[model samples]
Target: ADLEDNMETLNDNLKVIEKADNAAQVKDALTKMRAAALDAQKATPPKLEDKSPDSPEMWHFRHGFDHLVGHIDDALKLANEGKVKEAQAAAEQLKCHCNHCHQHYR
Candidate 1:
């Protein structure tokens, strides 16, 4: 339930990133996104040791969450550098991770 709620919050952050017209706005959104990802990571259940139809592969689950967080970091970096479009792309990458994990685990 907490994880689901986090994902929804992430979606809201993504919407902000997508609509942002400037680097400052993108950076602000990415910062929020990063914090939300960290919250979700803390709330996540322990990873499964082995692959199962009912669970995410432990390695992918951890790495995917890390990667999503990394992208948020990257987005903030780009925004700080005044690369608005690139920052937005980085934020967009978050969706890929979310979809991949949810498809298998949630």
Candidate 2:
């Protein structure tokens, strides 16, 4: 249940940070999520040993994961500076990353 715990903690923080319409909570959540994601990235499988890194699963997630993380940071900064709309837009950028990762990995 480690994954669930990590995800839940991350999600709970995210919900508060994301919907609270407050800078502090959003910054906190972004910090937590960024750490969680970095952990996940380290543990994530890049290939099936003999498989190529360019495989669909790896290709899709790898490219977007970095982008998503960057966006998360940018969004948090923007939100903290009272850039609400920009933060929202940055967050939405992750949708494309998530969508592609899920489609290929799942």
Candidate 3:
């Protein structure tokens, strides 16, 4: 259920962002989401030696998290600077990263 827990946290964060009425709410949600992404990035995979650092699975997982984090960061920056529309777009892009990875690995 570890994966489920992580996914739940991510979904909860997204929900908050989606209904956020002000920049402060969006900023807080993005910060939490970024933290979740960092937690996911630290996950240790199973003992499949073949799936080490350069393996496609590992590569996608890392790249996905990196992209997610970047998107979240951008969203936070935009929200902090009062760019509401741009922040919303970046948040949507973040969800796309989640979907892209889930389609391949989940």
Candidate 4:
């Protein structure tokens, strides 16, 4: 899938994360979020399909994906520690970051 499809998947998993009751639930959603974000990195954004892959614009695009994964990973670690409330806070950061990326790229 392209960026569009992956965004949908990411959003879906985010919903799961937001409502998760335990570390196990958040862990499951985090894994799916990680996969979708990485896959999205492979597909060039429609806004920059005309640009070279090595272009700074594309670099920023991939950077956003990597940043998102890092966020998910951070939350996963929190989940592992049984910090459900704190982990959910981490999950909250994800949507804010996503919207920031969208403001510029979408």
Candidate 5:
């Protein structure tokens, strides 16, 4: 598991969620996203590798992953309820995590 590989999975599924035509597809993408986020949470980003677990930088890293996990959960809940609009709305917020984190970490 390369970290970038996990990120690629995240981005791919994000796109799938963005334009999915059915509930099943959206739910599937959210499932994959949840898995990817879980995997990514275990990874130490290249730039943050030197930081300790309790350091502010490391806190940001974990916080970002937590945000991703929570968002995926919210999206999945909505998708399961057939609330596709809210599901996508929740998933779409994931990009902010992407851009902001990538701005600091590799």
Candidate 6:
């Protein structure tokens, strides 16, 4: 549930950032995104005491989540260099994480 909340916020914020037309808006969005990523960095994974290792939903969600987070990091690096185009592409890839995860798990 917590992961879901974090990912949803991250995804939504990325969408907004991608649409931003100015550097100030981009920077502001990056600030919010960094906060979201920091929150996730401190968060614990879902409890799965009863779940089996063979759970496809479990594995896929974990993979998708990690990849999405990595993509955000990539975008952050690009953003830091003022490479908005690269950052935007990375953001789009991040959305793919959400889509693939939803298609497989939900």
lDDT-based ranking? 4, 5, 3, 1, 6, 2
Tens-digit per-residue lDDT, 1-106, candidate 3: 3555767788998888788787677778788788888787766444423576777788778788888888788788898889977897778767788789777766
lDDT of each: 0.73, 0.62, 0.77, 0.86, 0.85, 0.65
Number of the top candidate by lDDT? 4
Weakest 10 consecutive residues, lDDT, candidate 2? 41-50
Point out where model 4 deviates above 4 Å.
21-23
- Candidate 3 ranges with C-alpha deviation above 4 Å: 44-50
Mind sharing the TM-score for model 2? Answer: 0.64
- Evaluate residue 106 in candidate 2 and report its C-alpha lDDT on the 0 to 100 scale: 32
TM-score of 4: 0.90
TM-score per prediction, in order, is 0.76, 0.64, 0.82, 0.90, 0.89, 0.66
The model with the greater lDDT, 4 or 5, is: 4
- Candidate 1 off by > 4 Å: 45-59
| Model 2: pairs clashing at backbone N, Cα or C within 3 Å | none
Q: What is the lDDT of residue 92 in candidate 2?
A: 55
Error of 4 at 1 (Å): 3.4
Q: Is candidate 1 or candidate 6 better by lDDT?
A: 1
Q: Which ten residues in a row have the lowest lDDT in candidate 3?
A: 41-50
List residue ranges in candidate 2 displaced over 4 A.
Answer: 1-6, 45-56
TM-score of 5: 0.89
Query: Cα deviation in Å at residue 11, candidate 2?
Result: 3.5
